Design a protein around this nucleic acid. Structure first.
Ligand SMILES: Nc1ncnc2c1ncn2[C@@H]1O[C@H](COP(=O)(O)OP(=O)(O)O)[C@@H](O)[C@H]1O
Lengths: 271, 269, 306, 136, 68
RNA sequence: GUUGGGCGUUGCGCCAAACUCUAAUUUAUUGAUUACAU
């Protein structure tokens, strides 16, 4: 109230050259900082049973620690790689995971009043589009850690990415066809993401429209069509080897086949 | 009369065909400041040619320079011009959203000075400063037909003397060029500036469509109006519903006066 | 030694001292090749004589550090690229606030560091007769102007210790230094060392000369032999040669060829005269190649055209 | 359009449905395309093709509400319908990356820019995943 | 272009005002200028300081909606 | 993608050669330089 008085503003505006008064103003700002620092230091000392709830959100977001708020103008403070910063400026996926886990943990600790392990309760949690804002590194880890932090909780969820839907056994993932329910084929618990995409989502690993994909298809058609060196295998090989590189497990195999075909026309000359 | 050599060079460039070469030719012959006597007819010709030569050009962002922004200390990127798609890929927490947030706060300024007279826009807030530093700066170069426009937007904490002053030399140029082209010809195509944030998840709802017929009539139909609430994300659907109603109403209101006219011709026959 | 000889020539220094001679400036605007208008304020035809005289007086006791080819006598734009020919990389700075923010407060202390003594009356004379007031009002802000005949040498003196220290730093890292007014170009042969040079120039531009001028964080450009490399108009070839560039190289030869056929108007004859004259200060060879291809009889018709 | 509760009607698989009740993965794209088309029509007056305008469109987190079957046909379809608009976008789905040249994708980590490896165009999704996201 | 150029008076020097609004494009043909009215408002603001109970003029308009 | 050479249906078309630190030169009635008229 004192520092925001209209009379003080009028006095400051009247005398711009107020270095003597500017010294007092900076002293007041230093007092501001000291008082705010003391008020915040009266906070970041101890905690309570909230520590168990806090441990739930440090596991899903590695590199996060020291979650408090600030008794200065209100904000929540995290520490990321020894860089203290506000929660309002975290990443979108980081905030999504933080809010989700914090809300579930709050619910679980309020339902269970007195327990040695409040965080493993019994209930139902439904998540829609779990892969909304998540990197593929977190997509193959979100569920195995979710079932571990929360043990006796059902987690019926919907997904839109192969990476998240290859950490669950094939008998517990449900596929909704045009009008009927179908079960996934065996081999999903630890299979390659390409296999999951090909036999669970009905999508080709190679985009069936690009020019390079069609060129590769024509090249694979020509190599096995008894003309392995009819100048067009040559043109397309010179293109694809330069594009993909000489070391990829799609053209190395086919070049090995071409070499075998080259060898096959050596002993047949005398025939 | 000894036309200056720079004037002759600009005339040669305009003869080859450029849009700025004739812009700085109808503002050199329309005032006494630039050093040549003002001729009105031969400045009007250059203005008309400058506006006519603007068609067929694409407006693209060429490069960008972040310094002490949200999470990047010093970043320099160059976007391809022969390619029409750039993709940012990275972990959640690296700063791909930061680059888009830096492309805006400059795209907002460009839209503001291309549509309105406000000459205002966004800026670097105190919470976006890199933790520990004092100064930040974002620089964007805008491209049009191979001729580039500079820009820089900066801030300094109010405890130290500012070491980076704002400058908007090229975007004022671009806005003036486009406004003059509109002035001479009301149907000159203008670039589109918009971003779609993740908040477009809840874009369509029954609440928006319920009162879409209760908005102002002059907010949707004019060239200079497809810029409001366009860089805020949240792809607008209420205004789209009003627009769709008006177009379907034009189809359902005309094409019946056409049928009535055909019936009138038959009756007159 | 300024006030003593001020009244010797044109003894009208008593007047024009109180009649704000810094205000005696005409402002016009020249068009750039691209976006931009360049304000230029030049003095009245009388003030330029006094400014040239005081430049000559100042030159008596000064020293200008090397590696700064900014308007020093007998040093064209070629020697700027001559130093940079042996390098592989370049980092082109471009300073902002082109001469329009160098206040007189930053010249007197620069001279004090230069170890030259100036009188208080002489200091007032320097502040009053060698600067420009934009506001055109009494007790205004004085800034150096792009266009005054006294701009180059003061612009050089205000940046002398910076140049010496940056040259000393560049010597230890095998980096070549050069500067034309504000076209600071850094070149090196080692790989991934230009970042250190940029950090050093940024931290030394904000320490001696202050936070007054800053690095334009828009035109900071990198280059190598992979792409085109230039140092102030001169093109450096991948074969370590200094040439103009293929476009200009073919333009000049096309014009001189059209001269022989006699299908060119007299307006462009002066154009070829200027271009051939200029193709002696950057590439001393090109005209010899034209002589080798077209002949001496072709070249010795434009240089002495009637 | 249906004027009783002032709502729109769209037909799929010979079934009439309202837009407000459609799938969440089909209304976001609908509104995005509608907004781009309307803004291009407004900004570009009477012409042979009003969707051939220029400008900057920043589609942030394109992977939202998309099955990994449309991600292989979203960028090229936007470029085919709108062939003169820059489309600086960001993504996390590795089935959007393998449709664009390697020289365009700009990897970001630890506050630094890294160029994509050679041959990021149409290839095996496992290889793009491994060599652009560092995920096994 | 469009411009309203009403001029006020306070028993003395004329205090002008131009209220203008032009479509983007033709922008140089009409601009607003609030110099005189800002000065007059500053005069009354200074008057309220030297004399707290200083007289002010009355400004009001009444459409047809007074009794409807 | 950028640089230097050659020919002439020469305000530049073609030919013949090369190079890749993640990364291209624009200001005059001003001052320095080449050149003609002095
Ligand atoms: N004041 C700050 N201090 C330190 N880091 C900051 C600050 N402000 C923003 N950041 C960084 O900006 C990052 C936010 O990432 P973001 O721009 O949302 O990209 P994305 O959404 O792709 O993850 C965070 O990693 C955060 O550390």
């Amino acid at each position: 109230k004192d520092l925001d008085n209209p009379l003080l503003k009028a006095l400051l505006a009247e005398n711009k050259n107020s270095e003597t008064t500017k010294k007092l103003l900076e002293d007041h700002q230093n007092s501001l900082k000291v008082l705010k620092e003391k008020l915040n230091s009266y906070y970041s000392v101890n905690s309570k049973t909230l520590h168990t709830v806090e441990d739930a959100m440090y596991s899903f977001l590695p590199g996060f620690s020291n979650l408090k708020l600030q008794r200065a103008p209100l904000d929540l403070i995290v520490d990321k790689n020894n860089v203290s910063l506000s929660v309002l400026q975290l990443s979108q996926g980081e905030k999504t995971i933080l809010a989700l886990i914090a809300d579930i943990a709050r619910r679980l600790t309020l339902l269970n009043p007195n327990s040695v392990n409040p965080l493993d309760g019994t209930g139902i949690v439904l998540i829609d589009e779990i892969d909304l804002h998540l990197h593929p590194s977190w997509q193959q880890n979100i569920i195995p850690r979710l079932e571990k932090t929360f043990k006796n909780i059902q987690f019926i969820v919907t997904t839109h990415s192969p990476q998240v839907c290859h950490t669950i056994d094939s008998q517990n993932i449900w596929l909704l066809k045009n009008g009927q329910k179908f079960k996934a084929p065996k081999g999903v618990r630890g299979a390659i993401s390409s296999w999951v995409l090909e036999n669970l989502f009905e999508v080709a690993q190679r985009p069936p429209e690009d020019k390079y994909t069609k060129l590769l298809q024509e090249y694979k058609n020509l190599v096995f069509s008894e003309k392995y060196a009819s100048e067009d295998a040559r043109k397309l090989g010179a293109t694809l080897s330069q594009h993909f590189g000489p070391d990829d497990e799609t053209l190395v195999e086919l070049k090995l086949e071409i070499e075998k075909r080259i060898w096959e026309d050596d002993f047949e000359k005398d025939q | 009369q000894n036309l200056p050599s720079r004037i002759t060079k600009l005339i040669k460039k305009s003869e080859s065909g450029d849009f700025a070469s004739s812009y700085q030719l109808y503002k050199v012959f329309g005032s006494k400041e630039y050093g040549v006597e003002p001729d009105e007819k031969m400045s009007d010709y250059f203005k008309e040619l400058s506006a006519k030569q603007l068609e067929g050009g694409q407006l693209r962002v060429a490069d960008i320079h972040l310094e002490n922004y949200k999470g990047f200390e010093s970043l320099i990127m160059d976007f391809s011009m022969k390619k029409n798609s750039t993709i940012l890929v990275g972990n959640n927490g690296c700063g791909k959203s930061t680059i888009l947030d830096a492309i805006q706060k400059g795209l907002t300024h460009l839209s503001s000075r291309l549509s309105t007279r406000s000459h205002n826009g966004d800026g670097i807030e105190k919470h976006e400063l890199r933790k520990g530093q004092n100064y930040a700066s974002i620089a964007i170069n805008y491209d049009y037909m191979g001729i580039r426009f500079p820009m820089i937007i900066a801030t300094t904490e109010p405890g130290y003397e500012d070491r980076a002053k704002s400058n908007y030399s090229g975007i004022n140029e671009l806005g003036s060029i486009f406004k003059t082209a509109h002035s001479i010809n009301p149907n000159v195509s203008f670039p589109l500036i918009a971003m779609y944030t993740v908040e477009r998840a809840n874009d369509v709802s029954t609440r928006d469509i319920e009162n879409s017929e209760e908005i102002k009539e002059a907010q949707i139909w004019d060239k200079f109006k497809a810029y409001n609430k366009s860089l805020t994300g949240k792809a607008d659907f209420k205004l789209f519903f009003r627009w769709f109603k008006e177009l379907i109403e034009i189809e359902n209101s005309d094409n019946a006066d056409i049928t009535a006219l055909r019936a009138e011709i038959r009756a007159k026959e | 030694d300024i006030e003593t000889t001020l009244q010797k020539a044109y003894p009208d220094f008593d007047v024009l001292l109180k009649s704000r001679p810094a205000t005696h400036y005409k402002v016009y605007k020249i068009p750039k090749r691209t976006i931009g208008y360049r304000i230029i304020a030049q003095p009245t035809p009388r003030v330029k004589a006094i400014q040239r005289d005081i430049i000559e007086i100042l030159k008596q006791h000064t020293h200008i550090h090397d590696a700064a080819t900014a308007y020093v006598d007998g040093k064209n734009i070629l020697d700027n690229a001559k130093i940079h020919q042996s390098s592989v990389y370049l980092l082109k700075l471009d300073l902002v606030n082109f001469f329009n923010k160098i206040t007189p407060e930053l010249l007197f202390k620069a001279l004090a560091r230069q170890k030259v003594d100036i009188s208080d009356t002489n200091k007032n004379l320097l502040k009053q007769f060698c600067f420009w007031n934009r506001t055109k009002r009494k007790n205004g802000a004085l800034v150096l102007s792009v266009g005054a005949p006294s701009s180059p040498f003061i612009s050089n003196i205000v940046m002398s210790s910076f140049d010496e220290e940056i040259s000393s730093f560049c010597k230890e890292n095998k980096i070549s230094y050069s500067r034309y007014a504000d076209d600071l170009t850094f070149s090196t042969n080692e790989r991934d060392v230009l970042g250190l040079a940029h950090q050093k120039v940024k931290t030394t531009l904000i320490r001696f000369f202050g936070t007054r001028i800053i690095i334009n964080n828009n035109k900071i450009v990198y280059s190598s032999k992979a792409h085109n490399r230039h140092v102030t108009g001169v093109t450096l070839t991948n074969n370590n040669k200094l040439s103009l560039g293929r476009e200009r190289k073919r333009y000049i030869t096309s014009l001189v060829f059209k001269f022989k056929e006699g299908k060119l108007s007299n307006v462009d004859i002066n154009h070829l005269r200027g271009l051939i004259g200029f193709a002696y200060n950057i590439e001393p060879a090109f005209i010899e190649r034209l002589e080798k291809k077209y002949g001496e009889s072709t070249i010795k018709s434009i240089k002495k055209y009637s």
